Amino acid sequence: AMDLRVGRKFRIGRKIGSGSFGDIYHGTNLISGEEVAIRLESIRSRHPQLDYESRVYRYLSGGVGIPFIRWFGREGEYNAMVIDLLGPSLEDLFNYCHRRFSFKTVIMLALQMFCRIQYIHGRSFIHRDIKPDNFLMGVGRRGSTVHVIDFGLSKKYRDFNTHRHIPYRENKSLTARYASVNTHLGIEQSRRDDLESLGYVLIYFCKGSLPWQGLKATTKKQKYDRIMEKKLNVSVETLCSGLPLEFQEYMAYCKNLKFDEKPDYLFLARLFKDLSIKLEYHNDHLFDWTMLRYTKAMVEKQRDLLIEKGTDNKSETFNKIKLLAMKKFPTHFHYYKNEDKHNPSPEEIKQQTILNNNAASSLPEELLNALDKG
């Protein structure tokens, strides 16, 4: 009754995620007690893919950030896939940080995503569905490692016996937000299209929005048309206005790639790694949500101290907590300026550090212990 099991090894716990026409459940191994994620797909679905990506995970097994499948098989009405438990997605962490990421976090994330994508490409695969929702963090000591999920639209771009690329095709069926420009044109997706999609995600992280977002039209077909009209029209410079030039150089590189040529992954790595050096970012594995969760927890336990010896708020209180953390780690938090239509130099970006150092929060007696923290 209350003991539902999958694959005779895992018990089903609380529901954690709801995929499209599917559900994701937290679970534990009956014998070892290891936490697992359980994906359930009903057989009565118009487009089943759980069996397919099950084969993909097992083929991409042995890679960093590639979720190791613990078991796949059928359970009653459902197809059941069991992997090791993962943390929230980047879209989840985006909402956690109120949809704005620091320059540091974006670069740290970009460097991890570059390796994930290159590995998948190195196994003769392309993802074809790159969005913040398909990148998850680990739990426990894997919490620093970015993982990749959802290979339902994944496809082999080359043969294995020979490295010959798939032929150039058109009128291939048109995720409108992060899709490549060539994907809108019906052109076959390639390795270039994945990296271009990745760029759209990174720019989306810095600005919190994209040009094709929030476009209005009377006829709903025109709504979809305006977005396509937007991607093709917008220049790379306009797209990466308030961002460092490294971002523009990335998008320019990816959109200039041929249909079959191999990307210079090492160049993309150095490009942002050089930027982090300029911005004086160190490899300390500290994301925005990492410092925010810590600062939040540090402040809230001080409440109990005050008591013993004594939804609108959330946007205001998080703002107070974000500012305090911004003061505690002034070198880490650098953000994109909405006003700027030019590419800011590392100096202007490093100028924010001084501003963050000379920052003042509302809380008085609580901040006194935050001074005592040091």
Partner 1 sequence: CLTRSNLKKLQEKIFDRELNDIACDHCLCSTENRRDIKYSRLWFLFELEMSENWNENLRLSCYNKYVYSAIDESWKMENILLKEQEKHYEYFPIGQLLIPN
Active site residues: 129
Give the up-direction half-sphere exposure of residue 280: CA atoms within 13 A in the CB hemisphere: 15
What string of DSSP letters covers 250-312? HHHHHHT--SSPPP-HHHHHHHHHHHHHHTT-------HHHHHHHHHHHHHHHHHHHHHT--H
Q: Indicate the DSSP class of residue 219.
A: S
Give the range of 142-150, 152-160, 213-221, 246-254 binding partner 1 by CB under 8 A: 142-150
Residue 138 near partner 1 by CB under 8 A:
yes
Expressed in percent and rounded to 5, the helix, strand and coil fractions of the chain are 45, 15, 40
Q: What are the residues whose beta carbons fall under 8 Å from the beta carbon of 123, sequence distance 6 or more?
A: 59, 60, 63
Residue 95 near partner 1 by CB under 8 A:
yes
- Given 19, 100, 139, 224, the residue binding partner 1 (CB under 8 A): 139
Q: If DSSP codes are grouped into helix, strand and coil, which group holds residue 160? A: coil
- Given 286, 321, 323, 324, the residue binding partner 1 (CB under 8 A): 286
Among residues 71 and 294, whose Cβ is nearest to partner 1?
294
- Given 9, 19, 59, 96, the residue binding partner 1 (CB under 8 A): 96
Q: Which helix (H) or strand (E) holds 94?
A: helix 90-96
Q: Which of residues 288-327 bind partner 1 (CB under 8 A)?
A: 289-290, 293-294, 297-298, 300-301, 303-304, 311, 314
Residue 331 near partner 1 by CB under 8 A:
no
Residue 247 near partner 1 by CB under 8 A:
no
Residues in binding contact with partner 1, number by CB under 8 A: 63
Residue 282 near partner 1 by CB under 8 A:
no
CB of 76 to partner 1, least distance (A): 4
**Contact code string over 11-30 relative to partner 1, x by CB under 8 A:** xxxxxxx-----x--x-xxx
Q: If DSSP codes are grouped into helix, strand and coil, which group holds residue 53? A: helix
Q: Which helix (H) or strand (E) holds 96?
A: helix 90-96
- Given 2, 232, 360, 371, the residue binding partner 1 (CB under 8 A): 2
Q: Which helix (H) or strand (E) holds 146?
A: strand 146-148
Q: Footprint of partner 1 on this chain (CB under 8 A)?
A: 1-6, 11-17, 23, 26, 28-30, 32-35, 64, 75-78, 80, 85-89, 92-93, 95-96, 112, 137-145, 284-286, 289-290, 293-294, 297-298, 300-301, 303-304, 311, 314, 373
